[PDB]
Subunit: 103 residues, 3 copies
């Protein structure tokens, strides 16, 4: 699976590594795939307008070949959102994650 994140916060290198590590663990654990199949990207310092403001925000695309659904997506969303809340102070109302179950 891949998680491709974009945020308007300029993230420092240490915080970036922390997020990549935390997201790797969360994606592997919750979908049920080995970490060797999990890729996380963090595009930071990307200007974002959401709801008419440029307050801190993030966008993510989570793509998996199977393994998604109502019993998984809610947990992934909550877990990744909490990582960005703690590490970047991004409110969950300004983080949109799009899930896609790929053929």
């Amino acid at each position: 699976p891949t998680l491709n994140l974009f945020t308007n916060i300029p993230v420092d290198a240490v915080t970036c590594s922390d997020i990549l590590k935390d997201a790797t663990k969360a994606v592997a654990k919750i979908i049920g795939k080995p970490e060797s199949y999990v890729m996380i990207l963090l595009n930071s310092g990307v200007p974002i307008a959401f709801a008419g403001t440029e307050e801190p925000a993030a966008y993510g695309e989570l793509i998996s070949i199977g393994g998604l659904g109502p019993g998984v997506n809610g947990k992934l969303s909550e877990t990744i959102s909490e990582i960005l809340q703690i590490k970047l102070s991004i409110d969950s109302s300004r983080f949109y994650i799009k899930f896609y179950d790929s053929p």
Copy 2:
């Protein structure tokens, strides 16, 4: 909806904010929803080759998007980028639909 934009033009902060605001207004009007439903990202200074040159170019992905809206929407964003950045070439893709 989310519009994820990429351009090889390096864009200054004010022009970026103007584009984000212009695009927010245009998307909101064309889709008929409040701005609280609209996210615009601008990835700038991303090298792009299009039709075998690196002339000014933009690429946009539309996520979580009425019929015909996509064409009027993509053309309007294309016009905004031409006016604000002098980008003469652009491509828009409806993603995950």
Copy 3:
């Protein structure tokens, strides 16, 4: 088609232009469409973890209108991975590509 690349190493403008040009020629030849239809993007300096590590890596999304014939995806994957190997020393084991078969055309201007 569009190839949107992301890599975690910094890439200088000359190397970037080489990658963009070689990727344009390779995608155009393998897919059979003229270069006028090919767009390549290179997002560099993007932190990536793959298999739990941050060694040089790349992600690519290849978006084609209607998808490609049997075997063509694998040929594209191999060819792009060689470009990234030659130009950036990214091992092919750390290149991850996703193909999108778009059921509707791009909007181009």
